[model samples]
Target: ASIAVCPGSFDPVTYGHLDIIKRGAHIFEQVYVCVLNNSSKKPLFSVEERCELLREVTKDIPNITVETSQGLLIDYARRKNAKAILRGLRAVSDFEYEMQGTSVNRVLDESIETFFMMANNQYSFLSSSIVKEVARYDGSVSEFVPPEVELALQQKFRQGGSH
Candidate 1:
């Protein structure tokens, strides 16, 4: 079974990610959307919450699995027996950083290929930080997130956060 691993922080899974995941599923038999729980970066949502958010958004996307992973991404890929790493590219600036990540992953595991898919124009600039900032200042995030995640964001903000 061919599997592609799509790894990201996924502070909140956006439709942009959904687009890439849907597209990835077409080429690979299965797509694993893994949330990176890197201590280097603080996340708006907890690791479990991030996984659950992706789960809710992708529940209907058969063949796609949502999960949270730590340590090396290539390690996670090897564990899943995956062959490709799917990345959602938003703009030209994302290229450099993503290239570095892909190159490092290749060094870690040459068998795994990395593929980049451009995000939908509408969500090219959407990010977790932007999403949190919007909610922090009391702005609508309905268009930025899925129904399940939107509700979760509101509740988080209303409750003054996941803490």
Candidate 2:
């Protein structure tokens, strides 16, 4: 059985992210939707909150497991015995960023491979940052994120600047 790791911050778990994750599930026997903790950036949601949201969003996907990691992605993949690292490519600009990470991961571990899936045409322009931006301004993001995520965003921004 092959295991694949899909690592991302998943601040709000947009539909675009779910698209890639759902597709990854079909290809791998098991998929780990890991919420990576990046200390360098300030997120709208906490790591625990992000994990909770991801768990709730992906609960229907039996093969998927929601997790959080604070260390090297390659190390986490090794610990899980994952055969591949799955990522979503939104556009040409994403290629360079993904390529750099894949190159470093290759040097770190040759056994595991990286797979990039193009975002579904409808969601090619969707992202957590954009979702949050629209939400922050009280705009409708219903089409970009799940209802659960939309509610969460509303609750988050209702408090105003707490994050």
Candidate 3:
């Protein structure tokens, strides 16, 4: 099966993330959703936790795999034998940034392509940070994340002393 790599921080997978994954699953024979391990920022969920959640949510999807990797996304894609990198664009700002990265990645490995999909309008404004912000204030994030993730967010905030 042909493979595509969908890599992100996914501190807590949001509906928007799932939206892209769902769509990507249809476009590629297989979609590998990878949690990025970035050392610069403190995330609400550990890489393992993020990968586990992603894996659980995508279990029913026949062509999806959830995992964790550090370093360049192109390198990861190469290792996974993915021919494309999947990304979600919520708006023009996202397009601008993604286009720049696509250019760089094309230079790094012309064989691997980057494909961007628009987020479903309803989830266009949803992001992990936005969910975290709302979750921190005890706001209902049930609309933006799965019930499992919502519960995890609540538990995280409670453990972190509220955000």
Candidate 4:
């Protein structure tokens, strides 16, 4: 069966991220939207909130699962018996970085392949970090995020630090 794991910090999975998950579902039997847990750079959303947000936006994607992982992406793929790791490629700069990271994952485990889907131009400018930065300054972020996320960010921004 075709199964893949789409791993990312997610922070708050955008429509762009959901687009990739939707595309992955068309090709794979199952796709897990794994939110990576890391504290190196505190993210906009908590791991649980990120998982829930992804689950909400991707609800229509059948056979797609949303969860969180605290370990390496390849290890997360291994946990779910996924055969590949799916990512979105927006430009040459992203390609260079993703290519190197893909190589490392391959070096760690040759069984799983790294697959990519190019993002549409409109979403090419949006990312969780960028969204957070915009929200931090109290700028409108409705375009960069889902309604649920915008509400969450507004609530959080009123409370404390955005980064």
TM-score of 4: 0.89
Task: Name the top TM-score candidate.
Answer: 2
TM-score of each: 0.91, 0.95, 0.92, 0.89
By lDDT, the better pick of 2 and 3 is 2
Q: Which candidate model has the greater lDDT, 1 or 3?
A: 3
Candidate 3, residue 47: CA error in Å? Answer: 0.8
Better of 2 and 4 by lDDT: 2
Off by over 4 Å in 1: 161-163
Q: For model 1, name the residue pairs that clash.
A: none
- The per-residue C-alpha lDDT of model 4 at residue 37 equals 87
lDDT of 4 by residue, 55-75 (tens): 877787679989887788888
What TM-score does model 2 achieve against the real structure?
A: 0.95
TM-score of 1: 0.91
Off by over 4 Å in 2: none
Q: Residue-wise lDDT of candidate 3 within 1-163, one digit each (tens)?
A: 4899998888899999999999999988988998988545788888998988898888899999898876888999999999999899887878676787899999999999898888867999878888888888878888899988988887777774424
The lDDT of each candidate is: 0.84, 0.91, 0.87, 0.83
* C-alpha root-mean-square deviation, each candidate: 1.8, 1.3, 1.8, 1.9
Q: Please give the distance, in angstroms, between residue 63's alpha carbon in candidate 2 and its true position after superposition.
A: 0.3
